[PDB]
Ligand binder design. Structure first.
Ligand SMILES: CN1CCN(c2nc3c(c(=O)[nH]2)CCCC3)CC1
Ligand SMILES: [Zn+2]
Length: 208
């Protein structure tokens, strides 16, 4: 039941999603090993992901969380990078999309920094890079990220450099405690707490 609707570059919605993508690029501690060397992207396409059943699954769970947290879903828009982006947009997030080895346990991880999610497009640590050239810094091959609506509810705060949520919480927030420029990362433990709203197709750009 998934349909993908292309947004025009003239559409304010295209422009606001592009800006979130470009404006949350940072430098990574690996010097670009996992995700490549770049300061900005070439955005090729932004599509709205439309699935009624997956949307209703999300909103149902959002209302449950909200009623357990003084009517506050604590909903954010966050990036997700994965080799399984085609399955996510068709069947939703579920326990097959869980980072078993994540630092906050086996859940589904999201980032405020688009460049953080970019490191996972070709797999954990960037895998072996693009399928065509085996290059984690490929500037030719088209990459995809999801920009997702995520219900955090009561989030457990972890200060730091499928499982269950900590008791009494709906998610975990990984707060950076060393790299002053890094934005937060987040984990949910139920697929129904995220909806993949935008599919973004891009290339990373070689710095001049
Ligand atoms: C194969 N899995 C795909 C998604 N994945 C993933 N992890 C993270 C992020 C992400 O976008 N995808 C952003 C925060 C850091 C962790 C874990 C590995
Ligand atoms: Zn390539």
């Amino acid at each position: 039941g998934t349909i993908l609707i292309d947004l025009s570059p003239d559409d304010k919605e295209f422009q606001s999603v592009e800006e979130e993508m470009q404006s949350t690029v940072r430098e990574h501690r690996d010097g670009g090993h996992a995700g490549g060397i770049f300061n900005r992207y070439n955005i090729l396409k932004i599509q709205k992901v439309c699935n009624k059943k997956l949307w209703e699954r999300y909103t149902h769970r959002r209302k449950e969380v909200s009623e357990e947290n003084h009517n506050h879903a604590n909903e954010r828009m966050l990036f997700h990078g994965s080799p399984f982006v085609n399955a996510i947009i068709h069947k939703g997030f579920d326990e097959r999309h869980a980072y078993i080895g994540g630092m906050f346990g086996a859940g589904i991880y999201f980032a405020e920094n688009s460049s953080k999610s970019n490191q996972y497009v070709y797999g954990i640590g960037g895998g072996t890079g693009c399928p065509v050239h085996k290059d984690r810094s490929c500037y030719i091959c088209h990459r995809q990220l999801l920009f997702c609506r995520v219900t955090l509810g009561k989030s457990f705060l972890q200060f730091s450099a499928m499982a269950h949520s900590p008791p009494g919480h709906h998610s975990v927030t990984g707060r950076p405690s060393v790299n002053g420029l890094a934005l937060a990362e987040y984990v949910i433990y139920r697929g129904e707490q995220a909806y993949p709203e935008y599919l973004i197709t891009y290339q990373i750009m070689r710095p001049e």
